[PDB]
Amino acid sequence: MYAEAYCNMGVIYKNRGDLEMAITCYERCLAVSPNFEIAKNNMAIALTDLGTKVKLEGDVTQGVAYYKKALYYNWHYADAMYNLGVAYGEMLKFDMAIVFYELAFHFNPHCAEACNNLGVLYKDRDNLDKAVECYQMALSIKPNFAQSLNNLGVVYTVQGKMDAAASMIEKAILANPTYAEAFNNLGVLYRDAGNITMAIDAYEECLKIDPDSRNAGQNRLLAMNYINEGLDDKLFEAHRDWGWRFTRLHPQYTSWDNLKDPERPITIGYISPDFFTHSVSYFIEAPLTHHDYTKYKVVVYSAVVKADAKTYRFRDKVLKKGGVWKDIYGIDEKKIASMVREDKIDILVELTGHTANNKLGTMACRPAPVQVTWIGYPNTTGLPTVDYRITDSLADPPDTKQKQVEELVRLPDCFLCYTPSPEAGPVCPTPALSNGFVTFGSFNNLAKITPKVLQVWARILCAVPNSRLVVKCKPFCCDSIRQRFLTTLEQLGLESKRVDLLPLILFNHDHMQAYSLMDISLDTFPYAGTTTTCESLYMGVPCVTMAGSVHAHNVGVSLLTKVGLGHLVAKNEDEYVQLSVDLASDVTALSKLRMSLRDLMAGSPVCNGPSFAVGLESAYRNMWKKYCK
Amino acid sequence: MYAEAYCNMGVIYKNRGDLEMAITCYERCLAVSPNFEIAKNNMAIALTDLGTKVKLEGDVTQGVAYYKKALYYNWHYADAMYNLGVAYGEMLKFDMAIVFYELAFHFNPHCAEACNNLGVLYKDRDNLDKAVECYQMALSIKPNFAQSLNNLGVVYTVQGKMDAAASMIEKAILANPTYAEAFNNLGVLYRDAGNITMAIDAYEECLKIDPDSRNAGQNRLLAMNYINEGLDDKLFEAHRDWGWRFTRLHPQYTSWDNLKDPERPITIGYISPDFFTHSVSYFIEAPLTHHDYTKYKVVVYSAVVKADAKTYRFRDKVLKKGGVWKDIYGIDEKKIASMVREDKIDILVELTGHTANNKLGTMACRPAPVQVTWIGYPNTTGLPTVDYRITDSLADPPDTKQKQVEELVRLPDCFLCYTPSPEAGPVCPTPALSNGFVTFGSFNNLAKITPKVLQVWARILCAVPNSRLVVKCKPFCCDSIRQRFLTTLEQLGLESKRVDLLPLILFNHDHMQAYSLMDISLDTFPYAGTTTTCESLYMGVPCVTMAGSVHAHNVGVSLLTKVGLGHLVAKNEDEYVQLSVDLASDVTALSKLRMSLRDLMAGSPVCNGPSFAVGLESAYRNMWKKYCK
Numbered sequence A, B: 001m002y003a004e005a006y007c008n009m010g011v012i013y014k015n016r017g018d019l020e021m022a023i024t025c026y027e028r029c030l031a032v033s034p035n036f037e038i039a040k041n042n043m044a045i046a047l048t049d050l051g052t053k054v055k056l057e058g059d060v061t062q063g064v065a066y067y068k069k070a071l072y073y074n075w076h077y078a079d080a081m082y083n084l085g086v087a088y089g090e091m092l093k094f095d096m097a098i099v100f101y102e103l104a105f106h107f108n109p110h111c112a113e114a115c116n117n118l119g120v121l122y123k124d125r126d127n128l129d130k131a132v133e134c135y136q137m138a139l140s141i142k143p144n145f146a147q148s149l150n151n152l153g154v155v156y157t158v159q160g161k162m163d164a165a166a167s168m169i170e171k172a173i174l175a176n177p178t179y180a181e182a183f184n185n186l187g188v189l190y191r192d193a194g195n196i197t198m199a200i201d202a203y204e205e206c207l208k209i210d211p212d213s214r215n216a217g218q219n220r221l222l223a224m225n226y227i228n229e230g231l232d233d234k235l236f237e238a239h240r241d242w243g244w245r246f247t248r249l250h251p252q253y254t255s256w257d258n259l260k261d262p263e264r265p266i267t268i269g270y271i272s273p274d275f276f277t278h279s280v281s282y283f284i285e286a287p288l289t290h291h292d293y294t295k296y297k298v299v300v301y302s303a304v305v306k307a308d309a310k311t312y313r314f315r316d317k318v319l320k321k322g323g324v325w326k327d328i329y330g331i332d333e334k335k336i337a338s339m340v341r342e343d344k345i346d347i348l349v350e351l352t353g354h355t356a357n358n359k360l361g362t363m364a365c366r367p368a369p370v371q372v373t374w375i376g377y378p379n380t381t382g383l384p385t386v387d388y389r390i391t392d393s394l395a396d397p398p399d400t401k402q403k404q405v406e407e408l409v410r411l412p413d414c415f416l417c418y419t420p421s422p423e424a425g426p427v428c429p430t431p432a433l434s435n436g437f438v439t440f441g442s443f444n445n446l447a448k449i450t451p452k453v454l455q456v457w458a459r460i461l462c463a464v465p466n467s468r469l470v471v472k473c474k475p476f477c478c479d480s481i482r483q484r485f486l487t488t489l490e491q492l493g494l495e496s497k498r499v500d501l502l503p504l505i506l507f508n509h510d511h512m513q514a515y516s517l518m519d520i521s522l523d524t525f526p527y528a529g530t531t532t533t534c535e536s537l538y539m540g541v542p543c544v545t546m547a548g549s550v551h552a553h554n555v556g557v558s559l560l561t562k563v564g565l566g567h568l569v570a571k572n573e574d575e576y577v578q579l580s581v582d583l584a585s586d587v588t589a590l591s592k593l594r595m596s597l598r599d600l601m602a603g604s605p606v607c608n609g610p611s612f613a614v615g616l617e618s619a620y621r622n623m624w625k626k627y628c629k
């Protein structure tokens, strides 16, 4: 009857914190008065609070049901929509989440958190402008929001605007000191900016704040890998510490069910998070199309954030050839291990290493008898659980001084196999004849460029008169970086008129054809590029690589030796200079060499598919035979 | 590249009607330009059209998925929300439907259909005011909408405002001639208004428009049941035609799996759509609480639109005593039959008949070996599939001339068992002493009142000087009905100062105690009331019923004979007059009779639970024994 007393008691209980008594009084009051607007709104508030409390325990479905009931009681309640969107993001239902966050923002403009999360979701789908404007609106509502600032820094780092990203990241750091993701992202930006010391200092601070930060430590090892000259071994100790901590942090499986018979078809699962237009994809294009599917079964574990045309064609080839394609995006590592075990897989090959969106969590438990890393992260994995790694004799000489935590297998010919792009197109003749001077070109990452490389390149330019230099890098999208690089080059005694810094090219065939203007390709050291060397050799421009005592330093040496140009490798910097001078001496030899290298690489073992496939299958058979005995 | 050509081609295909080519061009254009607002909106339009086309085929889930994708493309598209709400209403997910219809209305105020459907949904949950205002808004947008007018007429008919409902129903009929639900509802209102001839004419027109209208025909038979004097038999022929058409319209099951052993516990399933505060519920309160659950298992099939406290207590008693409670609201009859068969039920008892929200669709197939009607619709069911019906010897004398399509079983004592309300309260003494005159009272439905009853009541009033008359009926909520009734009474020679027409009482105990002002209760004929007689006898006021040749006419006779007041029954109208005069002759006898009748009914077989339960269980055992042999 008297619903006023019931609602007053319910309000008192809610303020006191008793949800059951309050919800009972609220229920009875609404039964007495079905159209009590204030009572209905308070009922919605109480149900939202109860749903949040339940979601604290972990019952997602019950919280969602309570939220839906509250929304039914009050359709235009914003916090309910926000909670629904958060839950839908948790359950990986992205479209419903987008809709609900947008509705929450429309109803309540003052919900900056919803806008920030919407920007996050849009950025996860490579909608850069939408994320930028979402974060800008978040700043418009709450200028002092740390998460929005950090994610805007992420987006600007991806876009290449390093100065603004650095400014905003520093603003976030000074806003919140106990916030490590800002340190990690500052250091990521520093690494992509071409300087390493402050990047290492940054992740060191980050690890001090967060001892158990996986991303921070992993990228810290990656950053140290850049400046490894092969003289010190503290990097090995850091890798060992990372591996031991990671192993002690996660459980492992010691049970196996695979048959002990060494004579049976092998299930090979290629697990990789980057099957889109990535360097790795190129080198995986041929083997998948070249395996004996009947003799060896093939499965794919793709964690790609966004599938592309290459992903679709790979899926078509796998399914047509008798394979299984699976998507593992947005799944916890434990579920990944469980599904891997339940798939009766024999061997697994990971192609990520300590890189973006890696899946070392799978290796945390060793779900399969054999796990091997083959391409990504040329340096040692550092995990004791990881058993073996794939390499050759050239990049890894038997007398190497590079200690490895895991055993190595030397492939007969090489462990690289490049695949031409379908629309690569013809190669234009040597432009030296048109312009009358040599134009050295480098299409490597700025992070691989070091002061030593700059000095060597300056010596190269000064050695031969009338020499041009062209460099293509993403960080050459900002004027400040360009000015700093030009000033650094001039400090060594090089004019700025002979330097051409170019930005990225969105269209792949344009990037492929951009090699037409280059004459001689020069590789950076110590962390020498791998895909760039093959890309250059395919277009006919000669490539020069310096040797070294590290596997990554010798990748280019191995590639050049295999393709048939082993005479184009210099052991020391001085020999590099003399080789470059000899190359620049004559133009006709360079021209006809450019003409021949196309067919030379076509007929080389590098481009041979069936032979490499047979060698790799024999390697797998030997691996399984060793496991059986 | 050129997305303009792709979008133009897609528009051309959509106009031409080619959905596949249009969706392909739309897909490629959005891939080229991820942020083409016009292209995105047209994509949403095309997806909505495709979803509607798919839902035409019948694939509800695929249409819902397409609608959700379209909404993701365009969050503020109203038609998508409308379609989502329609689908959610189809899948019986009511709360989500309410939310989505409300959102669609908020985005697009010009969607009168969404408002109409929202009003329908709210009315389905007894939210009368919300439905009224929804339909009023629909008229505010589209005054010429037939469905909104008809449903507003429904609501006003339920509320008791018959004049406005009739006006709006006539408006709907003249708006749309080929629209039978309007005829059915006009006739329903006429039936509830107390007049039958035009109601029968109305459903006759309705059946002419729609030969296979189940509701129209069923309620047509119900209406004829009101004016049945036991002289004509055309009603039996109409029932036979209805039964034959219904049987030929639906399939039947001829397979049985129940054991042939006559000695085993019997599973009895009480199927009824009205387990809320309804007359039937009262008479079912005792048997369920009085069965031998161990010897006979009990299950309940409730199709109640809205559960109440009585429903909750019945569920508690069933579950506590060892029974199963099931809700069958919003389920197709085929699924009902399938679940009934899968429940291993032995016998089923239906308590609806040709009444509101009946479930004769279940009887269409005879899912159980034994189906019996016991309470609802005292007249014959008319379905040949229905095997047997329950009655006694008093209301159904062995020498009856009322032919029945189904065999009858005569219970030993009676087939009625009333249950007192827990809060009935004490009975006040006879008010005749306070006021000095007799006050006849009638608490029956207006539809049961006929001109013959009015003439008889006028004769009763004129016979004894200083007599008051009080009548309680729902249609006495409108002034026009009251004036018409008073004019009709005055035309027979009765003053209006001795007539008191009262409306309904919302609170049950108030209705129970309203009998305190009554002195003698008078029953209508031929369709005599059943629950009202027991309700009156429980409060101590004597009840008078005229005999007849019909079962419904003799229900009151049987009740009065069983309770012990068989001397208070008159065979003819004249004997009714003399009995009433004799009752009114003395006041002291009436007073002490009022005092005694409480205990008299308490000790009568009518209120005896265990004895009736034993008799009913013996009846069931005999039924199963007959089935076995």
Ligand SMILES: C[C@@H]1O[C@H](OP(=O)(O)OP(=O)(O)OC[C@H]2O[C@@H](n3cnc4c(=O)[nH]c(N)nc43)[C@H](O)[C@@H]2O)[C@@H](O)[C@H](O)[C@@H]1O
Residues within 6 Å of the ligand: A278, A279, A280, A375, A376, A377, A378, A443, A444, A445, A472, A503, A504, A505, A506, A507, A508, A511, A529, A530, A531, A532
């Ligand atoms: C397999 C891995 O390869 C890694 O090489 P890594 O440094 O990324 O050498 P990157 O040249 O930076 O790889 C980026 C890839 O993107 C493409 N790409 C390069 N420039 C452009 C451009 O300007 N526009 C567009 N649209 N695409 C471009 C090209 O296929 C190149 O291989 C090694 O670091 C690892 O050790 C390992 O060998």
Ligand SMILES: C[C@@H]1O[C@H](OP(=O)(O)OP(=O)(O)OC[C@H]2O[C@@H](n3cnc4c(=O)[nH]c(N)nc43)[C@H](O)[C@@H]2O)[C@@H](O)[C@H](O)[C@@H]1O
Residues within 6 Å of the ligand: B278, B279, B280, B375, B376, B377, B378, B443, B444, B445, B472, B503, B504, B505, B506, B507, B508, B511, B529, B530, B531, B532
């Ligand atoms: C079991 C069935 O009973 C049927 O009796 P039927 O006409 O509905 O006789 P009614 O009196 O109309 O039934 C309506 C029920 O609602 C309650 N009720 C009556 N008046 C009021 C009121 O003023 N206010 C409120 N809140 N409740 C009221 C009371 O329990 C009454 O039995 C027969 O027609 C069938 O043949 C069959 O016997």
